Structures are given as structure tokens and as C-alpha cells.
Amino acid sequence: KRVEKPQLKFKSPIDNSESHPFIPLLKEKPNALKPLSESLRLVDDDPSHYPHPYEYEIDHQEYSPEILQIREEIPSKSWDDSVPIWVDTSTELESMLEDLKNTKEIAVDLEHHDYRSYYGIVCLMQISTRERDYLVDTLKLRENLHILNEVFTNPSIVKVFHGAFMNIIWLQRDLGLYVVGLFDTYHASKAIGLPRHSLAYLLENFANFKTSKKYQLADWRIRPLSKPMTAYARADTHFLLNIYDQLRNKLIESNKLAGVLYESRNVAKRRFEYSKYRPLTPSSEVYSPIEKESPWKILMYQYNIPPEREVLVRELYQWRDLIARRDDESPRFVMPNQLLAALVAYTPTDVIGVVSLTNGVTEHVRQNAKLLANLIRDALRNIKNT
């Protein structure tokens, strides 16, 4: 089935130019120890960038006293005692905010899609309280979701994530949301020393819930959500707060709870920045999209491409990236590396040669077949001549 691109309906439209470092979308700072203005000042190269607006809060805000005590475990609600709450209007979101205000702890997760978007888009957000599960349309509510900062940056309310390492970045980038009061069960599992540290492992073992493999590979932009996708999304957070109870208590017992909160604070402090503006020195502290050695080299060796073609290979890499940025698509939607490898290996020099490649071609390659053939012809002419 055809899925229209939801970015088209975004209020602020998508900018892949990377003209300037990432600017936090945050316009209000609840639960502040430091003025937002003082947070929003740019930093000089040392590259230039904005700092984490809640950095001070994460470092110096005090955890809720409840997280500190051994406390008996509160089981997850019976799956069938309730329906997941679908949140896609301004109103439903506001009602949800009021509910979240009344918790001491909540479970959060997201679904992210990167095939039909250059950087990616957050398609769903899952939030569970002790009582209910919420499923939030982050496509339709992109420009509204910031109000959750009231609860997400409230340090007296624990936010439970399993492996928040990327989700922290994505909350920032798309919804302008930050987390103060994070507990990451991934780090908890690690400190405990469990044989596995996946959500799947925890769900099977503390919740007896069997996950089907491959649904986070599904296309989460589609509306409405399929019933299995609804359930698997709900499942991500439905069970997590109990898991937190059990892991927290053992951490308290094992003398390792302080260590997990530190790790969780390091996860929370993670900042979203563009790859051009990435840090000079490698760090788990910052994530940027690209930060490595030139991927064409593997691809030439892998498809056994003659050594003379680095520039052809590199030229295709640049075009694909530029075109992906222009049309707001992943590079693999534009042209999988394997198709790229096919173009370089077989060097078709006319439209028919490009399109009739044994691989078959993508929509972008069909549309730009003449350009691609010209790009290739020049390399063949230039390889001979030069």
C-alpha cells in the first residue's frame, strides 16, 4: 500500500542542509535550576555548538527518595483490564499530561523510522504509568509534544527506559524533549550481571512475554496501526515499571544502584548534533550521524572492483547523499550500496544500461539514469585519458 510522507504535513519543514549546529527546539524550561537563556548560549570551537539545555539539571538535581528505598514489586496490570490509550489530538495529549503529573514513575519508549527520511523521524511514543499504557502519535503531535518536559524533566518522577542511548537523541531532535530522572534498565541489567541485556530477554523472563522478531523493522508511519503493532508497541512499556522495581531492589541490595544512576545520567546528557559539527575526539557523550572512514573502500574490495575506480565510487556516494538530503530519503532508498556496487562493477554508459541492470534499479536511479550514465562515462573517459 502507498504511504504518503508525513513530513509533508510537518509545521516546521525539514532542513537537511546542516548550515548551522543543531539548535534545541526548546522554548520553555520547566523544573529549571538555571535560566533557559543561560542554557541557550552558543559555544565556541575547541566545534561550535549549543550545549544541553538541561545539563546542569541532570548533574545537580536530586533523585526522588522512593528510588532509593527497597520497595515491594508492583506487578504490571493485567493486559486485558485495559486498552492502550491512543493519543493524537491536542486535547488527549493534554489530558495525558495531567495523568503523568500524578505519577512517581513512568515507562517510556519510542519507535523510529529511517528508510523514508534522511535523519529519521519519530513515529510513535509509548508511555506507561502503573495504571495505564499510552500510545502517542508523534507524527501528528510533533509540534505539541514539548509540554511533556513538565513531567520528563521533573526529577521527582522516574522515567524508565530500556536502552535510552538513541531515544534520548531522537527526543531532542524531533520533539524538543529532555529527560531528568532517568533510570535505564539496560544499565541496570548490566550492573546486575544478567546473561542477556535485551528488552526481549527481560520481557520473556520477568514478564513471560514472547516478542516476535522483526516488528521494529515494520513501517510505523502507517495509520492506523495494525493490531499486532499496537500490541507490540504497548508491550514495550506495559511491563517495564515492574522490571524497574525488581532491578532497582537488587541494585539496592547489591551495592550497585549508585553506579546505574550515574550511567543513566550519562545517557540522559547525550546531545543531538549534526555530523558536520561532530566532536573532534570520540565520545559516548555525543552522537552524530556520520563519523568514520570512507565506506567505499569496503565496497570495492567486497565486489572486487578494479582499483582505479575510487573516484567513481566516491562520486556515487556524494550524489546519493546529496539527493537523499534533497528529497529527505535514506541513502538506501535512493540507491542501496549493492546497486551502487552494480553500477561501478558494470559501468553502464547509457540510460538503457543503467535501468536494465541485473539488480534492477530504484526509483531514484530510473529518474536520474542519464545523469548516472554521464557520471560513469566521464569516469571511463577520464580513466583512459587520465
Rounded CA separation 344/299 (Å): 10
**What's the domain range around 138?**
1-293
CATH of residue 386: 1.10.150.80
Give CA–CA dist 231/21, Å, rounded. Answer: 38
DSSP letter assigned to residue 75: P
Reduce the DSSP state of residue 214 to 3 states and report it. coil
| Grid cell for residue 297 | 573502500
Residues 147 and 166 placed together within one structural domain of the fold: yes
Q: How far apart are CA 151 and CA 50, in angstroms?
A: 23
Count of C-beta atoms within a 10 Å radius of residue 138: 26
The residue type found at 184 is D
- C-alpha cell belonging to residue 304: 572486487
Place of cell 541485473: 358
Q: How far is 174 from 191, CA to CA, in rounded Å?
A: 31
Distance CA 165, CA 187 (A): 10
All three cell numbers of 21: 549546529
Answer with the one of 234, 268, 293 that is the final residue of a domain.
Answer: 293
Asked if residue 338 and residue 286 are part of one domain, the reply reads: no
Residues 217 and 339 in one domain: no
* Residue 63: closest CA among 179, 182, 240: 182
What does the angle CA 284 – CA 290 – CA 292 come to, to the nearest 5 degrees?
80
- 234 and 305 together in one domain: no
| 167 and 199 fall within a common domain | yes
d(CA 173, CA 275): 13
For residues 273 and 214, is the Cβ–Cβ distance under 8 A?
A: no
Same domain, 267 and 304: no
183 lies in the same domain as 156: yes
Of 269, 293, 317, the position where a domain reaches its end is 293
CA distance 68 to 251: 10
Do 289 and 300 share a domain, yes or no?
no
Bridge pairing between strands 271-272 and 182-184? unpaired
Q: Which grid cell sits at 271?
A: 546531545
Instruction: Answer yes or no: do 94 and 133 share one domain.
Output: yes
Q: Give the list of residues 6+ apart from residue 194 with CB closer than 8 angstroms, or none.
A: 201, 202
Please state the length of the chain: 386
The grid coordinates of residue 386 equal 587520465
Count other Cβ atoms within 10 Å, centred on residue 202: 23
Q: How many CA atoms within 13 Å lie on the side-chain side of 92?
A: 13
Q: Measuring CA to CA, which residue among 107, 209, 228, 82 is closest to residue 157?
A: 107
Question: How many domains does the chain divide into?
Answer: 2
Name the E strands within 129-197: 133-137, 158-161, 182-184
HSE-up of residue 149 (Cα within 13 Å, Cβ side): 22
Which residue stretches of the chain are H helix? Answer: 36-39, 55-60, 90-100, 149-152, 167-170, 185-192, 199-206, 227-238, 240-254, 257-269, 296-302, 310-327, 331-334, 337-346, 351-355, 363-367, 369-385
Residues 199 and 104 in one domain: yes
Query: How many whole angstroms separate alpha carbon 152 and alpha carbon 161?
Result: 12
Q: What's the CATH code of the domain at 78?
A: 3.30.420.10
Give the span between the Cα atoms of 373 and 48, in whole angstroms: 40
| Per-position b or e across 38-66, b if 16+ CB within 10 A of its CB | ebeeeeeeeeebbebbbbbbbeebebeee
By CB atoms closer than 10 A (0-12, 13-18, 19+), residue 228 is exposed
Are residues 271 and 320 located together in one domain of the fold? Answer: no
What is the C-alpha radius of gyration for the chain, rounded to an integer number of angstroms?
24
Cα–Cα dist 253/264, whole Å: 19
Residue 320 in grid coordinates: 546519493
From residue 322, give the alpha-carbon distance in Å to each of 106, 187, 329, 360: 41, 38, 10, 22
